[PDB]
Amino acid sequence: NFMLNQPHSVSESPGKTVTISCTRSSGNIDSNYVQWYQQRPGSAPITVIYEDNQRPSGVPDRFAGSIDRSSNSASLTISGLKTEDEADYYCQSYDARNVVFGGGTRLTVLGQPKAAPSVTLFPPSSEELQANKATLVCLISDFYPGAVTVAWKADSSPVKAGVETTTPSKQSNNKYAASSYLSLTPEQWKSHKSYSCQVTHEGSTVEKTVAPTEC
Amino acid sequence: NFMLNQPHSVSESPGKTVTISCTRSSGNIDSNYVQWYQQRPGSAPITVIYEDNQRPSGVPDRFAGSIDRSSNSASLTISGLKTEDEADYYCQSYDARNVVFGGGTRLTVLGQPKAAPSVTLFPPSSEELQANKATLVCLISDFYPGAVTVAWKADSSPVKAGVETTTPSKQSNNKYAASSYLSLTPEQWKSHKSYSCQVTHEGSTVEKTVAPTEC
Ligand SMILES: Cc1c(CN2CCOCC2)c(=O)oc2cc(O[C@H](C)c3ccccc3)ccc12
């Protein structure tokens, strides 16, 4: 009944080499093969190492696996670190009455460059207006770090009701996305000259404006 | 290179029984051992079943594995559901050397009433089209549990390229919201009769469609 012990967390800056260790609590590390998994936030894990040091196809050659018999440990070494490498890493081996996992190591890559959001404002769709709804959506994408402030306007005036903004989540380009949506009635949408979505990120503000359409 | 097919999600109240299936696309389920892994939210994976029906020590007998040769499927049955059972469950097997994982099933132990999502599909805005962008947005709101699967189509064919979907987040009404966006060029948009957003929640699938128009 052995366990595998990994650090809860490690951090390193881009271009440098980071090592993540996995210690076996009883028996010899070389009695069974060690695998490593990478898991990105709210997303599907992949195998980066199998049979201690073998990379599946598609895994960058920057990932290397090793065993140290004297410490009864295994290591994942990532050289020339990239931003995309930020993830949780798990080691795994085998124990007669079990497949055994380490507790996971969260790898933080430091110094990621700031990125301003792409902002797109959508007026109400035909289909939702037919169903007596006039929800607007403001898509905010490609931003880093993962925090924004959103305000809406009805004509020039602040909107005080009906706004929701999703918690930003990290997408496949390693930058954040969120949507803000304003749940108008058709009467509210048609009774104003326009609505606006104002997005602030790192002290810069982007504002988009849409108006009732000519069909 | 057979596939293992699991349902996207399952849910029940505390004290109930739930079954998760795992269907092998080709070959005999019999030919190779099936493992089940549990990953609780924000936790490391643990093995709950190995060799089709063996429980590791510390795994309670409320967990049961089985094989059905006739349906070429494996099942995990959890009786006396507890709130700690909420997790992603993955089945796993082998064809010769190659390790194969199922897609995973989210199990929710219901903490509030079920709620079907509001799904709204927005066509491209005039302003993003002048920037050579025809991004579509699929807004998904007011849902519980928080698990959804999104798929896109160009006419009748599946898309994978250009799709991003946000991690669902709880909003001010204590229900989930998320958005999926498809990053088209105006040339891609105008060159199809339509595009579709398909949202699956709790074994209900809904589909919204938009078409390049001038009304
Ligand atoms: C999807 C997936 C993969 C990727 N392929 C999917 C098709 O079969 C071959 C492998 C994987 O390598 O490893 C996985 C591993 C999984 O579960 C293990 C227990 C795990 C590892 C780390 C975190 C969470 C779960 C679940 C899914 C996968």
3-class SS string, A23-66 = EECCCCHHHCCCEEEEECCCCCCEEEEECCCECCCCCCCCEEEE
A104/A36 Cα distance (integer angstroms): 10
Question: A103 CB less than 6 Å from ligand 1?
Answer: no
- Domain B120-210 in CATH 2.30.110.10? The answer is no
Confirm whether B4-109 and B120-210 share one CATH topology. yes
The H or E element containing residue A110 is none
The H or E element containing residue B189 is helix B186-190
A77/A1 Cα distance (integer angstroms): 27
Peptide bond into A145 cis (omega under 30): yes
CA B152 vs. chain centroid, Å, equals 14
Q: In what order do the strands lie in the sheet with A4-5?
A: A4-5, A18-24, A73-78, A63-68
Peptide bond into B145 cis (omega under 30): yes
B50/A183 Cα distance (integer angstroms): 49
DSSP bridge pairs for B44:
none
Contact A99 B47 (CB under 8 A): yes
Contact B177 A172 (CB under 8 A): no
Residue B68 φ/ψ, nearest 5 degrees: -120, 105
Question: A45 CB less than 6 Å from ligand 1?
Answer: yes
Place of tokens 């048609």: A190
Domain ranges for chain B: 4-109, 120-210
Method: X-ray
Fold exhibited by the domain B4-109 = Immunoglobulin-like (2.60.40)
Tokens, residue B214: 């001038």
Q: By three-state DSSP, how is residue A71 classified?
A: coil
Burial class (CB in 10 A: 0-12, 13-18, 19+), B47: buried
B179/B161 Cα distance (integer angstroms): 16
A98/B210 Cα distance (integer angstroms): 50
Residue A114 near residue A104 (C-beta atoms within 8 A): no
The H or E element containing residue A129 is helix A126-130
Place of tokens 């954040």: A176
B164/B136 Cα distance (integer angstroms): 11
B114/B11 Cα distance (integer angstroms): 9
Residue B70 φ/ψ, nearest 5 degrees: -65, -40
| Closest-CA residue to A18 (of A82, A105, A77) | A77
A140/A123 Cα distance (integer angstroms): 15
CA A171-B162-A138 angle, 5° bins: 65
| Closest-CA residue to B195 (of B182, B214, B180) | B182
Resolution in A: 1.9
Longest dimension (CA), chain B: 65
Residue A64 near residue A80 (C-beta atoms within 8 A): no
B45/B89 Cα distance (integer angstroms): 9
Q: Which residues contact A99 (CB under 8 A, 6 or more apart)?
A: A92, B35, B37, B47, B50
CB count in 10 Å sphere of residue B109? 20
Place of tokens 């210690």: A23
**Which residue in A38, A40, A49, A125 has the most chain B C-beta atoms within 10 A of its own C-beta, making it the best mutation to test that interface?**
A125
A65/A19 Cα distance (integer angstroms): 10
SS3 content of chain A, % helix, strand, coil (to 5): 10, 50, 45
| CATH no. for A10-109 | 2.60.40.10
Residues of A near B (CB-CB distance < 8 A)? 1, 41-42, 44, 47, 50, 90, 97-104, 120-123, 125-128, 133, 135, 137, 139, 141, 164, 166-167, 169, 171-172, 177-179, 181, 208, 210, 215
Longest dimension (CA), chain A: 76
Contact B139 A137 (CB under 8 A): yes
B45/B38 Cα distance (integer angstroms): 5
Residues of B near A (CB-CB distance < 8 A)? 35, 37, 44-47, 50, 54, 56-57, 99, 103-104, 120-123, 125, 127-128, 133, 135, 137, 139, 141, 164, 166-167, 169, 171-172, 177-179, 181, 208, 210, 214-215
Tell me whether strands A73-78 and A18-24 are parallel, antiparallel or unpaired.
antiparallel
